[PDB]
């Protein structure tokens, strides 16, 4: 008893109903997978400049 094995028939019809949604985009993306040595430093850098602003609001 054999049957069809494979086809893409009708698959792009299905993907286009709800649509192929474009990637979606953020200002400030995640630092996921960014160099730890960088991030460690970036963390103190930021801390530093925050301080220097809250200070400038003494």
């Amino acid at each position: 008893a054999k049957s069809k094995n494979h086809t893409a028939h009708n698959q792009t019809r299905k993907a286009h109903r709800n649509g192929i949604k474009k990637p979606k985009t953020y200002k400030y993306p995640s630092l996921k997978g960014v160099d730890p040595k960088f991030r460690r430093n970036h963390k103190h850098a930021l801390h530093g400049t925050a301080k220097a602003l809250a200070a400038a609001k003494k």
């Binding site: 299905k14 709800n18 990637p23 993306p29």
Partner: protein, 159 residues
């Protein structure tokens, strides 16, 4: 049965370009990448470490990380009906700065200028691009150039 390893189907893709084998020229290593840069991806077959998978050949993405011998590139790949974010660790040998952007950067830098050149003068700018327009009228002269009359030519064999 079937076969679908990593570098499957890539015979001509990662192949090396006629009379261009060997050491990669040093300019490939002197180039410099910063997070945010736009890069095109294309595999140097002679550089097995740090290779893009063949799906990403011909593809263009953005740098998100700079590493000792590499850059991390984010490519948007569509699976099913949606894109997912992909992150690539590529050695600098498999990447170049895309010029997909120069026409923009060059156009911006220029757009500022003729805006200054207008304003300062007393406006009237118009600096959006425009499609090819149809042609205007014109008068073609016959002088030195009377029209040659051609006709269709008979059937003939040569052989």
């Amino acid at each position: 049965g079937k076969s679908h390893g990593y570098r499957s189907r890539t015979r001509y893709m990662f192949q090396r370009d006629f009379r261009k084998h060997g050491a990669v020229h040093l300019s490939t290593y002197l180039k410099v990448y910063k997070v945010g840069d736009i890069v095109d991806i294309k595999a140097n077959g002679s550089i097995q470490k740090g290779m893009p998978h063949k799906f990403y050949q011909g593809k263009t993405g953005v740098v998100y990380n700079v590493t000792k011998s590499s850059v991390g590139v984010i490519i948007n790949k569509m699976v099913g009906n949606r894109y997912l974010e992909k992150r690539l660790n590529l050695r600098v040998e498999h990447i170049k700065h895309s010029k997909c952007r120069q026409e923009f950067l060059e156009r911006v830098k220029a757009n500022a200028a003729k805006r200054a050149e207008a304003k300062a003068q007393g406006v009237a700018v118009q600096l959006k691009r425009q499609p090819a327009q149809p042609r205007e009228s014109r008068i073609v002269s016959t002088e030195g150039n009377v029209p040659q009359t051609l006709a269709p030519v008979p059937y003939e064999t040569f052989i």
